[PDB]
Amino acid sequence: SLWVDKYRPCSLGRLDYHKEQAAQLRNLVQCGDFPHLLVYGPSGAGKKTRIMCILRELYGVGVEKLRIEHQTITTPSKKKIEISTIASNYHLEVNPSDAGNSDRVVIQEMLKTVAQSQQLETNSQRDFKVVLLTEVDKLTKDAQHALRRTMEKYMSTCRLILCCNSTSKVIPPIRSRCLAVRVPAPSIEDICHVLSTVCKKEGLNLPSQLAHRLAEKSCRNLRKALLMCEACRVQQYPFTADQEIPETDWEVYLRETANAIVSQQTPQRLLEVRGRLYELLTHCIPPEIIMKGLLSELLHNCDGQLKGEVAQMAAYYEHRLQLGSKAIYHLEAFVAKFMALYKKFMED
C-alpha cells in the first residue's frame, strides 16, 4: 500500500480535479439507466479512480472488496487459455488483450458467464453487473466486433465500462453506442494540490518549489508524481526545495542509448545499440514506449530540418512495429536508418 492507493478517493465527492465532470457522472448515476461508458484519456490521468468512484456510487461499499479468480476458457481451435480476473459481487474486471488473437475467446464467453450470473445472482439493488474492460484499445478488429455483438445481446443484462488510452483503434460501431468520458491529464497546479494534500495527510510538509518541480517532472502523470514524491520521501526525511528528484532507471538507460547512437555511427556501435534495445525489451518495456523515448531523446541533438525527417522515420518504423511481431527488427531498423541519415548530415 503505497501513497497511490492508500489515498485513492472512494466517492465522487472526494475528487480534487474535474469536479464538474464528477458532478456530471454523479447525475449520470442517479438517473438509474446509465449506459455503456467509454472512459479514455492519458495514462495517470485518473480514469481508473473515477471508474471506481462510479462503481462505489452505483452499488454499495461492497465493491471495495476485490478477489482474484482464474478462468480457463476453451478456444474454438481447441487449446484452453487461462486468464486472471479481479472481481467483486457486483462487478467484474478483465483485460482480454492478454489473450492475443484469442481475445474474442474471452469476449464472447466471459461476459456471457456474467450474464449467466445475472440470472443466477439476485440482490434487488440493480438489474446489471458492471464489466470493466481494461486496455480495450489493444483489442483486434474481430475482438471489437465480438464486443459490439456482446453489448447488443446482453444490453438489459449487464453494463459495460471500457477503459482505454486512445480511441483511435476502437471501431466507430463500438463508439456509436457508448457514452464517451474523456478524462484529460490534470494541470500542474492540480498535481501540486494533490501532492500537498497527500503529504499533509501523511503528516509531512513539502515546499511549493519541490511540489512544482515534481509536477513538472511528472509530465502531467499523477501516478508518476505520487511515486516520485514517495521516492523523495524515501531519500530524505525532510523535504528541501533543492532535493534531487531521482530519475527513472529505464529512462536514463534510454538516454545513454540515444547518446551512444549519436556519438559514433559504426556497425559495432549499431550492434551495441541492438544489445541495449534487447536488454530493454527483456525488461518488459513496451517497444512503442521505447520508440517514443528514443525519439524524445534523439530530437535534442538534431537540427531543425533534420527533426521532421527523423520524426517521420520514427512514426514509420513504429507503424511497422505495430504491424509486425518481432519488434527488435523495427526498432533497430529505425536506429540504423537514423545513424545513416545523421552521418550523411554530419559529413555535409
Binding site: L28, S168, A180, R182, V183, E288, M291, K307, A315, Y316
Partner: protein
C-alpha cells in the same frame, strides 16, 4: 425497465416518416396488397430506413406478433457467414401459429432485418443469395445498407431498391425540438443547431447525444460545451493552434501543441478528420492540398493499425509544416 429515445420515438406507422415521398408511396402500395417484396434500403445513416421498415412491419403485422415475426441480424459477424445462415435457417424453420384479432389473417412470411449488408464479402453475399433462394416463399428479406453498389449482382437484381435521401438541417432541428419539448429538457435552439451541425445529418446520433446530455447534465442547461465533450469533437481553437504551429515553421512549438492535444485526451482520428475538413475547404494550392490529404489518408490508415497517436500526429504535422513553409 426504460428504453432509450432513439427507438422509442420512431414513427409508429408508415407516412408518419418525413421527407420521403416516393418511398412511402410504393411502400403503401406494397402494404395495400399485404405483399412486401424483398427490400434494399440504401442511403446515409440515420436517414430513417430502419424506422420506416419497422413502421411497415407494425402496419403489416400485429404488435404482439410484430416482435415475434421479425428478426434483426447484423452482417459484420466475425465468426463467418454460416452463423447467420443457420440463424435465419432455424428462424424460418419454426412455424409458430399466429393470428390477428382485427379480423385479418396474417400473411405467412417472416421478416429478417439484416443491416450493414454492404460489409459482406462476395462469397458471403453468394451464400446469402443461396439462402434467400432456398427460403423464397417462407420469408421475404430486407437489406439495410449504406451503398447500393456494394451489393453484388444476384441480390441487387431481385430486391426492390429504395434510396433514402438525407434530411435537411431544418427538419432535423424541428424534430430535435419536438424531442426536447416532449421529453422535458430545457435546451436553447442554437444548441440544437450545434447538435445538428455536429451529428452531420445523423439524426440517430443527434437523438442519442441529446439523451446522453439530458441524463448527464441533470436537468440543467445543455450548453455547447457538454455537447462537444459528449460527441468527442475537438474544439476549433485547438485546430487553429495546430495550423498556427505548422505555419510558424518551428518544430518545438509544434511538439508542444501536439503534446497539449494528446494529454487533453482528444482522439487522433477526430483530429485527423477535423484537419481534413479544414484543409479541403481552404485557399491552399492544389499540390499542397494533394500532399496533405494523401498524408492524412496514410496517417488514418496507420492509426487504424494501432500506431501511436503522438508519433503519427507529429509526422503528419511535420508534413503539414513542410508544405506550409516550402511556399513561404
Amino acid at each position: 425497465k426504460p428504453v432509450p429515445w432513439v427507438e422509442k420515438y420512431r414513427p409508429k406507422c408508415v407516412d408518419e416518416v418525413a421527407f420521403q415521398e416516393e418511398v412511402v408511396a410504393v411502400l403503401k402500395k406494397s402494404l395495400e396488397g399485404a405483399d412486401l417484396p424483398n427490400l434494399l434500403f440504401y442511403g446515409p445513416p440515420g436517414t430513417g430506413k430502419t424506422s420506416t421498415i419497422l413502421a411497415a412491419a407494425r402496419e403489416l403485422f400485429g404488435p404482439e406478433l410484430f416482435r415475434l415475426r421479425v428478426l434483426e441480424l447484423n452482417a459484420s459477424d466475425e465468426r463467418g457467414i454460416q452463423v447467420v445462415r443457420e440463424k435465419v435457417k432455424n428462424f424460418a424453420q419454426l412455424t409458430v401459429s399466429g393470428s390477428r384479432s382485427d379480423g385479418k389473417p396474417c400473411p405467412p412470411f417472416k421478416i429478417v432485418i439484416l443491416d450493414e449488408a454492404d460489409s459482406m464479402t462476395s462469397a458471403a453475399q453468394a451464400a446469402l443469395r443461396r439462402t434467400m433462394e432456398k427460403e423464397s416463399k417462407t420469408t421475404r428479406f430486407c437489406l439495410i445498407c449504406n451503398y447500393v453498389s456494394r451489393i453484388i449482382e444476384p441480390l441487387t437484381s431481385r430486391c426492390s431498391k429504395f434510396r433514402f435521401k438525407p434530411l435537411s438541417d431544418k427538419i432535423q432541428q424541428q424534430r430535435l425540438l419536438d424531442i426536447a419539448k416532449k421529453e422535458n429538457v430545457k435546451i436553447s435552439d442554437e444548441g440544437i443547431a450545434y447538435l445538428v451541425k455536429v451529428s452531420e445529418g445523423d439524426l440517430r446520433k443527434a437523438i442519442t447525444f441529446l439523451q446522453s446530455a439530458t441524463r448527464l447534465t441533470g436537468g440543467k442547461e445543455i450548453t455547447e460545451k457538454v455537447i462537444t465533450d459528449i460527441a468527442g469533437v475537438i474544439p476549433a481553437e485547438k485546430i487553429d493552434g495546430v495550423f498556427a504551429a505548422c505555419q510558424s515553421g518551428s518544430f518545438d512549438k509544434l511538439e508542444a501543441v501536439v503534446k497539449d492535444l494528446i494529454d487533453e485526451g482528444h482522439a487522433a482520428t477526430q483530429l485527423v478528420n477535423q484537419l481534413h475538413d479544414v484543409v479541403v475547404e481552404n485557399n491552399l494550392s492544389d499540390k499542397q492540398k494533394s500532399i496533405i490529404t494523401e498524408k492524412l489518408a496514410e496517417v488514418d490508415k496507420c492509426l487504424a493499425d494501432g500506431a501511436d497517436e503522438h508519433l503519427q500526429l507529429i509526422s503528419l504535422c511535420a508534413t503539414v509544416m513542410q508544405q506550409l513553409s516550402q511556399n513561404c
